[PDB]
């Protein structure tokens, strides 16, 4: 009982560590997304 609740709660903290990694990737996407982008025409998807 006590051991079971000490795993997923600790794994959620490690999921927050991976959450700090995706936020770092989102900040790079925020760098990869900048206002002055041109506009083209998509002929085929």
């Amino acid at each position: 009982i006590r051991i079971f609740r000490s795993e997923l709660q600790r794994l959620s903290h490690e999921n927050n560590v991976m959450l700090e990694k995706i936020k770092d990737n989102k900040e790079k996407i925020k760098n990869n997304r900048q206002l002055p982008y041109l506009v083209a025409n998509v002929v085929e998807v």
């Binding site: 206002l35 002055p36 982008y37 041109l38 506009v39």
Partner: protein, 122 residues
């Protein structure tokens, strides 16, 4: 004659890159500004450093930078008109008293044209 009265400022407003903006017209305003270049190219930019959010309007020429597109200074709309720019004159020749005689043609025109312009409160 004023040769040296200008180039003194040539080390700031000239050597640096500010003025060389690509003239283009803005289409849609999202408050993202969709602006179409004179080369037929579309893009999206934001505001500038000194640009006010109320200055940019729909259907108005907005100069953007050539390298990294951004709004810097607004431009007066309708740059295409050319011949009509020469239709404006100043200080004509014929005066008000050059018309021979005083008849009904003079009194009727001054009341419907000259009167509301000179005395709008009458």
């Amino acid at each position: 004659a004023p040769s040296h009265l200008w180039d003194i400022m040539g080390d700031r407003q000239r050597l640096g890159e500010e003025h060389p903006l690509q003239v283009a017209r803005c289409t849609k305003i999202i408050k993202k500004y969709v602006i179409n270049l004179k080369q037929i190219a579309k893009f999206v930019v934001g505001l500038g450093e000194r640009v006010s959010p109320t200055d940019i309007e729909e259907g108005m020429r907005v100069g953007v930078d050539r390298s990294k597109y951004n709004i810097e200074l607004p431009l007066p709309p309708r740059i295409d008109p050319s011949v009509t720019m020469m239709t404006v004159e100043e200080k004509p020749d014929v005066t008000y008293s050059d018309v021979g005689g005083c008849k009904d043609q003079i009194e009727k025109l001054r009341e419907v044209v000259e009167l509301p312009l000179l005395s709008p409160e009458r």
